[PDB]
Amino acid sequence: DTVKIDANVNYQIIQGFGGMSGVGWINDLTTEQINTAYGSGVGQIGLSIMRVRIDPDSSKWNIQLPSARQAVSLGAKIMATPWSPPAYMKSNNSLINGGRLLPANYSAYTSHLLDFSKYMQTNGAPLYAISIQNEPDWKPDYESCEWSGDEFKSYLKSQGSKFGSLKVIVAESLGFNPALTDPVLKDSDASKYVSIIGGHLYGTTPKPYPLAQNAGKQLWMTEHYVDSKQSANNWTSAIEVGTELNASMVSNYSAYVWWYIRRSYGLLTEDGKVSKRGYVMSQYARFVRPGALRIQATENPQSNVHLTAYKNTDGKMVIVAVNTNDSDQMLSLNISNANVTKFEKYSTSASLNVEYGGSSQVDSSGKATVWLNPLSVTTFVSK
Ligand SMILES: CO[C@H]1[C@H](O)[C@@H](O)[C@@H](O[C@H]2[C@H](O[C@@H]3CO[C@@H](O)[C@H](O)[C@H]3O)OC[C@@H](O[C@@H]3OC[C@@H](O)[C@H](O)[C@H]3O)[C@@H]2O)O[C@@H]1C(=O)O
184 and 69 share a domain?
yes
Distance of alpha carbon 106 from alpha carbon 364, whole angstroms: 61
Q: What is the CA(324)–ligand 1 centre distance, in A?
A: 30
Cβ atoms of residues 1 and 332 within 8 Å:
yes
Q: Are residues 203 and 74 in the same domain?
A: yes
CATH number at residue 188: 3.20.20.80
How far, CA to CA in Å, does 47 sit from each of 35, 94, 281?
10, 35, 8
Residue bearing the CA closest to ligand 1, atom 38: 228
| 202 and 228 share one domain | yes
Instruction: Find out whether 85 and 112 touch, Cβ atoms under 8 Å.
Output: yes
Instruction: With beta carbons less than 8 A apart as the criterion, state whether 123 and 65 touch.
Output: yes
Taking the centre of ligand 1 as the mean of its atom positions, its distance from the CA of residue 259, in whole angstroms, is: 9
By what method was this entry solved?
Answer: X-ray
Whether 119 lines ligand 1, by a CB cut-off of 6 Å, is: no
Please say if 135 is a catalytic residue.
yes
For 15-164, strand residue ranges (E) read 16-20, 49-54, 77-82, 127-131
Q: What is the CATH number of the domain that holds 319?
A: 2.60.40.1180
247, 275, 290 — which closes off a domain? 290
Considering the domain architecture, whether residues 66 and 173 belong to the same structural domain is answered as yes
Q: Are residues 383 and 244 in the same domain?
A: no
Query: 244 and 179, same structural domain?
Result: yes
Residues 281 and 322 in one domain: no
Measure 25 CA to ligand 1 centroid, in angstroms: 8
Cα distance between residue 379 and residue 346, in whole Å: 5
Rounded distance between C-alpha atoms, residue 276 and residue 299, angstroms: 24
Q: Measured between alpha carbons, how far is 137 from 176 in angstroms, rounded to an integer?
A: 10
Residues 365 and 273 in one domain: no
d(CA 324, CA 243): 9
Of 290, 308, 327, which one is at a domain's C-terminal end? 290
Angle at 202 between CA 296 and CA 192, to 5 degrees: 65
Q: Is 351 in the pocket of ligand 1 (CB under 6 A)?
A: no
Query: How far is residue 353's CA from residue 346's CA, in Å, rounded to a whole number?
Result: 8
For residue 292, how far is its CA from the centre of ligand 1 (angstroms)?
32
Cβ pair 40, 289 in contact under 8 A: yes
Ligand 1 centroid distance, CA of 105 (Å): 27
Q: Are 110 and 61 part of one and the same domain?
A: yes
Q: Give residue 303's domain range.
A: 1-14+291-383
Q: Entry resolution in angstroms?
A: 1.4
Last residue of a domain, one of 255, 290, 325: 290
Give the closest residue to 7 by CA, choosing from 227, 309, 331: 309
Q: For ligand 1, is residue 81 a contact (CB within 6 Å)? A: no
Ligand 1 atom with the smallest distance to the CA of 143 is 34
CB of 137 within 6 A of ligand 1: the answer is no
Task: Give the residue, by CA position, lying nearest to ligand 1 atom 1.
Answer: 228
**Count of H-run helices and E-run strands, the chain:** 9, 17
Are 280 and 295 within one domain?
no
Ligand 1 atom nearest 25 alpha carbon: 28
Instruction: List all residues 6 or more positions away from 292 whose beta carbon is below 8 Å from its beta carbon.
Output: 13, 14, 310, 311, 312, 313, 318
Determine whether the shortest distance from the Cβ of 201 to ligand 1 is under 6 A: no
Which atom of ligand 1 is found nearest the CA of 142? 34
From the CB of 270, is ligand 1 less than 6 Å away? no
Query: Which of 63, 226, 259, 275 gets mutated to test ligand 1 (max ligand atoms within 8 A of its CB)?
Result: 259
Q: Are residues 280 and 320 in the same domain?
A: no
Residue 50 and residue 90 in one domain: yes
Using a 6 Å cutoff on CB, does residue 140 contact ligand 1? no
Domains held by the chain: number: 2
Phi, psi of 42 (to 5 degrees): -55, 130
CA dihedral sign of residues 230, 233, 235, 241:
positive
Expressed in percent and rounded to 5, the helix, strand and coil fractions of the chain are 25, 35, 40
